[PDB]
Amino acid sequence: KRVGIEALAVAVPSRYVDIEDLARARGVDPAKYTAGLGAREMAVTDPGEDTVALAATAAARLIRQQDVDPSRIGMLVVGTETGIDHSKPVASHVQGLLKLPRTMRTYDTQHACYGGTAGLMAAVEWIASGAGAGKVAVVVCSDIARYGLNTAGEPTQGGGAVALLVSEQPDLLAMDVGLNGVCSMDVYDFWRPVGRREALVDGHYSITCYLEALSGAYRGWREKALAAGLVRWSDALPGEQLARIAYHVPFCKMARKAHTQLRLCDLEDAADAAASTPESREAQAKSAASYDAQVATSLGLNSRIGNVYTASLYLALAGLLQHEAGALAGQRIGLLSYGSGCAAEFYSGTVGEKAAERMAKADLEAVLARRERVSIEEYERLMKLPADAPEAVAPSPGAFRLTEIRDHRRQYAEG
Amino acid sequence: KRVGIEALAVAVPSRYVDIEDLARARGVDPAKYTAGLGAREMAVTDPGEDTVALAATAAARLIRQQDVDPSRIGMLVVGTETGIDHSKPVASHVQGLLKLPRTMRTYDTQHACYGGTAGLMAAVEWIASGAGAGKVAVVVCSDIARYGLNTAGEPTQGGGAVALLVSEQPDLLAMDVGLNGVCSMDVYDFWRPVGRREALVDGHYSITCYLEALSGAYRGWREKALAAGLVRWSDALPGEQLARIAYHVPFCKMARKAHTQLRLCDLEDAADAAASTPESREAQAKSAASYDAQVATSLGLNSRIGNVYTASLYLALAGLLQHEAGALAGQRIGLLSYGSGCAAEFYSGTVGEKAAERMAKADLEAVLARRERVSIEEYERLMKLPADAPEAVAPSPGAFRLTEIRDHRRQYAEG
Numbered sequence A, B: 001k002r003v004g005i006e007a008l009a010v011a012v013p014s015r016y017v018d019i020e021d022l023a024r025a026r027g028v029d030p031a032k033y034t035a036g037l038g039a040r041e042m043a044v045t046d047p048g049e050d051t052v053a054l055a056a057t058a059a060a061r062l063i064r065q066q067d068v069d070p071s072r073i074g075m076l077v078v079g080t081e082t083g084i085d086h087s088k089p090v091a092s093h094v095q096g097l098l099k100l101p102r103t104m105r106t107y108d109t110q111h112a113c114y115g116g117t118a119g120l121m122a123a124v125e126w127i128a129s130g131a132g133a134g135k136v137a138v139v140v141c142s143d144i145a146r147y148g149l150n151t152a153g154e155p156t157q158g159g160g161a162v163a164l165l166v167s168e169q170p171d172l173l174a175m176d177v178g179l180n181g182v183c184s185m186d187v188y189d190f191w192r193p194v195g196r197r198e199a200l201v202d203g204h205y206s207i208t209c210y211l212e213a214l215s216g217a218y219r220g221w222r223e224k225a226l227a228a229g230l231v232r233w234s235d236a237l238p239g240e241q242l243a244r245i246a247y248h249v250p251f252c253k254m255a256r257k258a259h260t261q262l263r264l265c266d267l268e269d270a271a272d273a274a275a276s277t278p279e280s281r282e283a284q285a286k287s288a289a290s291y292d293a294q295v296a297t298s299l300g301l302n303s304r305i306g307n308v309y310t311a312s313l314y315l316a317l318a319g320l321l322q323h324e325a326g327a328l329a330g331q332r333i334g335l336l337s338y339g340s341g342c343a344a345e346f347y348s349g350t351v352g353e354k355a356a357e358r359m360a361k362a363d364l365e366a367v368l369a370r371r372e373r374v375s376i377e378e379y380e381r382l383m384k385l386p387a388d389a390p391e392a393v394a395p396s397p398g399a400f401r402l403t404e405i406r407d408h409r410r411q412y413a414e415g
């Protein structure tokens, strides 16, 4: 008996900008974004590419690529911090756009960039409890990250959606139920009050909160993983025994910071830690070999899209399995989800034999291939457009766009 | 092995108005609100009684009244359609105000008035999956219903919060896991776009959607309950074999409509339905005897508070068990949750032997006793106050209020 992620699909906005064009535009050394942050291309949106449209594009693509029977979906959850109504959830819009049947729970989950994982766990545990046996769930992480012109967070902006298929046939990731570690605390590192279109953030403080919550979540998982015989204090650090580790990527260089911190948790908690110094522990924790073996190949997609909040971690999982699904089959990997506010959860799972099949059907290269580069000038023009003023452009085949808001009702079109 | 609701607590705003004062103020026949809608008293708020403050008051009261060990809480979820941030969830605020520890998931669930049930099921199935074994969850339904001055929905306004304790010791309601019926569809019956403080609603269309979604959800549950031997087609209709049925109460008279519809589902689907007429089926479905035996005693609290969206159904459960917990111990009851947008879920559970104990510790009479009546004139003045302008009044002991918003950070005080 297994449960977890069976397949995934992703949707991206139709436009992007080269990150070095953004630096030049802002009077910033390009190397700060490319080397300092690890960014290559930044997704940019117009009002037509809203949370619903992206979420529905991704979920409709999942059902098509993986040949999902819509009537087997018992749960449709949208994790997002870019909601479009205080009451009506994006999930209900997605249900209608996809013409899905009625025998399913629909709702949205919210906690910054952790909201997707929260919905994933609710779907997993709905199945694992037996309530969802014989059925599947679809959990969509959909967000548009917006910090504003001339802000420190601008180069980490992005947008898109990742639709996750959750079932008793977890071809991508059979998750280890009950082993999750979690760490949460009331903080103001990043937030976006109602009515404000741009987020508020204490940049370097959100990094500290990330690493603090990460440490607690990983340690919680490690304890449970030790008792279940999945890892051990041996010649290898417990975290080294995971084939790969994927982290929430607000920006690509954040994955190296997170991996260093995770390994420090092992080195500081090792029974022989007294024999080491902070200098020796940091040099070992920063091991380039460990980062290359465990993390480096998970950032290909994230570097060309930017921050997608709830979807960043699962874009990393996607980048990782896009190329290494076959090699990772039967191997256990770890995932760290973070949400400003804040909450972190660290969980593990085993990649399935059929993972390569499911990722090939996701055809991620073709998803990224359909985008077009625009100028910073055009990016800014689209940014200033009001949320109810989509561009008069058609969606791609099978994709969705917002067309207008009439009498407070949102209208959408399918390509 | 059992799982469900162990205990509950409720918080109410400090003010209310007599509903007949509202009618007189609006040039409406008082009997329309009292007889037509079933309302007695309508809760009213000032900006200090926001979603966080009400949610934190209820959850803090739960922990105190039921002597909960905060470090056993592994999940804290807030169901609400009155969010105060696009990113930071009410749950994270509640965590900080209550000074809870860190080993717990926090997030908000959204789907109109169904959002609390969604979070409840996520907590239940987290435990039932084994992931939450040995721990408890707290699910808070917190909302302020606001339609605006001189609107058709104004007399159904309200506010408050119900905090639910979810554990493997479901003293109030050991829920039948896996038997839920559910029915959802993309509709615009009721919604509230971002930035709009008052809800939009097609009144009588939301009633139809309620009854349509109810019918599907109940039928789904009934099918599963028939196969599990919990109900049977006998001299009694399947729905009659439930000791009680609690429904989402947007207004009190809505419970009679819902109960009539539920019974019609039985009468229309009965193998001998061909021998009946619509006239005979409606007269039997409207049975006053059945409504009095199954539903009537669940509306005492709702009638003095008004619509609390996510919390209305569980205020009904509270009113029911407040007086009949002892008699209902060992008996199975049904619950219907509705959320505009829309989604309905019907589920069942068995009242526990210790339910009367837990309800006595909730001391609901004293909760309602602390309120004060105000004038419609004062109600309107408080209504026009901006969300960031709380009244300079102290919270009650153990309760919380919003005090101000400084530099986009919300500040709260504990009484």
Ligand SMILES: CC(C)(COP(=O)(O)OP(=O)(O)OC[C@H]1O[C@@H](n2cnc3c(N)ncnc32)[C@H](O)[C@@H]1OP(=O)(O)O)[C@@H](O)C(=O)NCCC(=O)NCCS
Pocket (backbone or CB within 6 Å): A029, A031, A032, A035, A036, A037, A152, A153, A154, A155, A156, A190, A201, A202, A203, A204, A206, A207, A210, A250, A251, A253, A254, A340
């Ligand atoms: C991430 C963020 C905090 C950084 O912005 P900043 O404060 O303007 O950038 P910094 O001053 O920290 O510079 C970033 C890095 O690039 C480096 N850098 C700067 N100029 C450089 C250059 N010319 N060549 C190479 N590297 C350079 C810096 O040394 C720094 O390195 P380090 O991380 O290894 O120390 C900001 O983009 C932000 O707030 N983002 C939004 C929130 C977020 O994503 N938070 C993450 C946690 S969830």
Ligand SMILES: CC(C)(COP(=O)(O)OP(=O)(O)OC[C@H]1O[C@@H](n2cnc3c(N)ncnc32)[C@H](O)[C@@H]1OP(=O)(O)O)[C@@H](O)C(=O)NCCC(=O)NCCS
Pocket (backbone or CB within 6 Å): B029, B031, B032, B035, B036, B037, B152, B153, B154, B155, B156, B190, B201, B202, B203, B204, B206, B207, B210, B250, B251, B253, B254, B340
């Ligand atoms: C509920 C709501 C639709 C009713 O408002 P309304 O349209 O102004 O009221 P109606 O015209 O339907 O009148 C309501 C009832 O009171 C009765 N009534 C009116 N005047 C009366 C009087 N003087 N004496 C006795 N009864 C009276 C009506 O006959 C009607 O009865 P019925 O329900 O049994 O048919 C409105 O309050 C609303 O939109 N509420 C918000 C959304 C909501 O709660 N929806 C519920 C589904 S979630």
